[PDB]
Design a protein around this ligand. Structure first.
Ligand SMILES: [Mg+2]
Ligand code: NA
Ligand code: NA
Length: 324
DNA sequence: GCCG
DNA sequence: CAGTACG
DNA sequence: CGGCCGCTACTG
């Protein structure tokens, strides 16, 4: 499509991201996205600007890659970037921890492993470094959801379990497995993480826990690591959320994504005096001059994903159509 | 970074 | 709270 | 000028 140019930009977008320049990186993330989805290749400056998500600043650079064949901005990128990227790829460590480790003189995982102070999460992230960077065939994602569902329906056959994220969007491979668990009656889902997690631990399915507030009966999510039985099995990331039935649709929509899809949909809802989150879609929300939800509006009835789209004056989209 |  | 994370 | 998703959910 425009790979000759986007591949160069992605490098730049990733550099800003790891350095903590969140908004600039988002800028490139949207320009790079627009290009990759533009039918024909770009050839003119005006041809660029005309595109949404691309402005003068960007259009100018898109020129280079074509005429100049290469972007000269990529030649002055700090030598620190590759190391920052290496560091931030450790689950539990972000741009702030990466830059701190770098300022401290660390340059490799060997340095991190032997000299860095690690949080419980980062220690787990490091021990599964390569695994956390791989994707799994969707078939395996199925085996995992099935494993979780079986264990859950074991103590309550009424429990509804669904694999979301990239899986539900129908991608061939998945980074992790997102399992949404809820119950049709609307109450039989409270305080089950304890039973579910312990059940999964019994059979040795779960290998490590990253995020799991179990001392609290109000736990909403579980982020961990699991591994299927047998030879040739890798450790996989597992994310589970348990939600009340009334919030099923918003939860399903959220967990299905994509992330960028979710953000775009939420941005639209805000322009219409509404608010969308994984818990609910509300209308008549009260916002300050900075657009922050100060006053609550009214929660709208949203029994199905269809309803959320409808209420936002949007054509429904199949999961595969939300793969932004 | 782009957009209103 | 700041950091990092989920889609 | 200033928002860019969520009054998102944990961790320490
Ligand atoms: Mg996923
Ligand atoms: Na990380
Ligand atoms: Na815990």
């Amino acid at each position: 499509h425009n790979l000759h140019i986007t591949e160069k930009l992605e490098v730049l977008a990733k550099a800003y991201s790891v350095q903590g320049d969140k908004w600039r990186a988002l800028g490139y993330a949207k320009a790079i996205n627009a290009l990759k989805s533009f039918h024909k290749p770009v050839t003119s400056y005006q041809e660029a600007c005309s595109i949404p998500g691309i402005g003068k600043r960007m259009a100018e650079k898109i020129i280079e890659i074509l005429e100049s064949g290469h972007l000269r901005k990529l030649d002055h990128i700090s030598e620190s970037v590759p190391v920052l990227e290496l560091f931030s790829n450790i689950w539990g460590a972000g741009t702030k921890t990466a830059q701190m480790w770098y300022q401290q003189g660390f340059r490799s995982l060997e340095d991190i492993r032997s000299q860095a102070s690690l949080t419980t999460q980062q220690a787990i992230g490091l021990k599964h470094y390569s695994d956390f960077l791989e994707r799994m065939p969707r078939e395996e994602a199925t085996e995992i959801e099935q494993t979780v569902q079986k264990a859950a329906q074991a103590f309550n056959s009424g429990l509804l379990c669904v694999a979301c994220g990239s899986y539900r969007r129908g991608k061939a491979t998945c980074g992790d497995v997102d399992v949404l668990i809820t119950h049709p009656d609307g109450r039989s889902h409270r305080g089950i993480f304890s039973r579910l997690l312990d059940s999964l631990r019994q059979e040795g399915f779960l290998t490590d826990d990253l995020v799991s507030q179990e001392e609290n009966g109000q736990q909403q999510k579980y982020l961990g690591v699991c591994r299927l039985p047998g030879p040739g099995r890798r450790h996989r990331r597992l994310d589970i959320i348990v939600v009340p039935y009334s919030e099923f649709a918003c939860a399903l929509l959220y967990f299905t994504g994509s992330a960028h899809f979710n953000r775009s949909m939420r941005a639209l809802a805000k322009t219409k005096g509404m608010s969308l989150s994984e818990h609910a879609l509300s209308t008549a929300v009260v916002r300050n001059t900075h657009g922050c939800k100060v006053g609550p509006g009214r929660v709208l009835p949203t029994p199905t994903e269809k309803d959320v789209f409808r209420l936002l004056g949007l054509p429904y989209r199949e999961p595969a159509e939300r793969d932004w």
